[PDB]
């Protein structure tokens, strides 16, 4: 229940909703609302993660150099994963526009499948980051 974990949980819950591609999700995917709201949740997660690492550094027991660089890489992966999710949802909005009003059912099937894989990567990187934070502490 760290602050950054709760922020990530809000990003994660929002994204689990987007994954359903329900009527209201689809509406908000063609405006900028889903990507704006996800970006705000991503920014909060990253801000809290940075502050948490900064506070952990106050209670630390060449090895330090390596672990700090490894932790930085794991944080950067989490942020890139969230950016990749947002970018795929921006791509969807453009794909829909290019259809000129034709059915988007196939685009939605493909988006759902790809989102599942992006979410798997985000979750595995979150778990790796949490493990490194626990061992850093
Ligand atoms: Na959830
Ligand atoms: Na389609």
Curated annotation (Swiss-Prot):
GO terms for cellular component: blood microparticle; chylomicron; chylomicron remnant; clathrin-coated endocytic vesicle membrane; collagen-containing extracellular matrix; cytoplasm; dendrite; discoidal high-density lipoprotein particle. Changing residue 126 to P: In ApoE3*; decreased binding to LDL receptor. Changing residue 83 to A: No effect on plasma lipoprotein distribution. GO terms for molecular function: amyloid-beta binding; antioxidant activity; cholesterol transfer activity; enzyme binding; heparan sulfate proteoglycan binding; heparin binding; identical protein binding; lipid binding. Changing residue 108 to Q: In ApoE2-type; no hyperlipidemia. Changing residue 119 to H: In HLPP3; uncertain significance; ApoE Kochi. Changing residue 124 to A: Decreased binding to LDL receptor. It is linked to Hyperlipoproteinemia 3: A disorder characterized by the accumulation of intermediate-density lipoprotein particles (IDL or broad-beta-lipoprotein) rich in cholesterol. Clinical features include xanthomas, yellowish lipid deposits in the palmar crease, or less specific on tendons and on elbows. The disorder rarely manifests before the third decade in men. In women, it is usually expressed only after the menopause. Alzheimer disease 2: A late-onset form of Alzheimer disease. Alzheimer disease is a neurodegenerative disorder characterized by progressive dementia, loss of cognitive abilities, and deposition of fibrillar amyloid proteins as intraneuronal neurofibrillary tangles, extracellular amyloid plaques and vascular amyloid deposits. The major constituents of these plaques are neurotoxic amyloid-beta protein 40 and amyloid-beta protein 42, that are produced by the proteolysis of the transmembrane APP protein. Homotetramer. May interact with ABCA1; functionally associated with ABCA1 in the biogenesis of HDLs. May interact with APP/A4 amyloid-beta peptide; the interaction is extremely stable in vitro but its physiological significance is unclear. May interact with MAPT. May interact with MAP2. In the cerebrospinal fluid, interacts with secreted SORL1. Interacts with PMEL; this allows the loading of PMEL luminal fragment on ILVs to induce fibril nucleation. (Microbial infection) Interacts with hepatitis C virus (HCV) envelope glycoprotein E2; this interaction is required for HCV infectivity and production. APOE is an apolipoprotein, a protein associating with lipid particles, that mainly functions in lipoprotein-mediated lipid transport between organs via the plasma and interstitial fluids. APOE is a core component of plasma lipoproteins and is involved in their production, conversion and clearance. Apolipoproteins are amphipathic molecules that interact both with lipids of the lipoprotein particle core and the aqueous environment of the plasma. (Microbial infection) Through its interaction with HCV envelope glycoprotein E2, participates in the attachment of HCV to HSPGs and other receptors (LDLr, VLDLr, and SR-B1) on the cell surface and to the assembly, maturation and infectivity of HCV viral particles. This interaction is probably promoted via the up-regulation of cellular autophagy by the virus. Belongs to the apolipoprotein A1/A4/E family. This is Apolipoprotein E. It comes from Homo sapiens. The lineage of its organism: Eukaryota, Metazoa, Chordata, Craniata, Vertebrata. The gene is APOE. The chain holds residues 41 to 181 of 317 of the full protein.
């Amino acid at each position: 229940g760290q602050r950054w974990e709760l922020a990530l949980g809000r990003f994660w819950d929002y994204l689990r909703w987007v994954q359903t591609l329900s009527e209201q999700v689809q509406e908000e995917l063609l405006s900028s609302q889903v990507t704006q709201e996800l970006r705000a949740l991503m920014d909060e997660t990253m801000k809290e993660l940075k502050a948490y690492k900064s506070e952990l550094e106050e209670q630390l027991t060449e090895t330090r150099a390596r672990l700090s660089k490894e932790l930085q890489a794991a944080q950067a992966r989490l942020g890139a994963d969230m950016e990749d999710v947002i970018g795929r949802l921006v791509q969807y909005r453009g794909e829909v526009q290019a259809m000129l009003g034709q059915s988007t059912e196939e685009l939605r099937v493909r988006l759902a499948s790809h989102l599942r894989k992006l979410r798997k990567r985000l979750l595995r990187d979150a778990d790796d980051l949490q493990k490194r934070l626990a061992v850093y502490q």
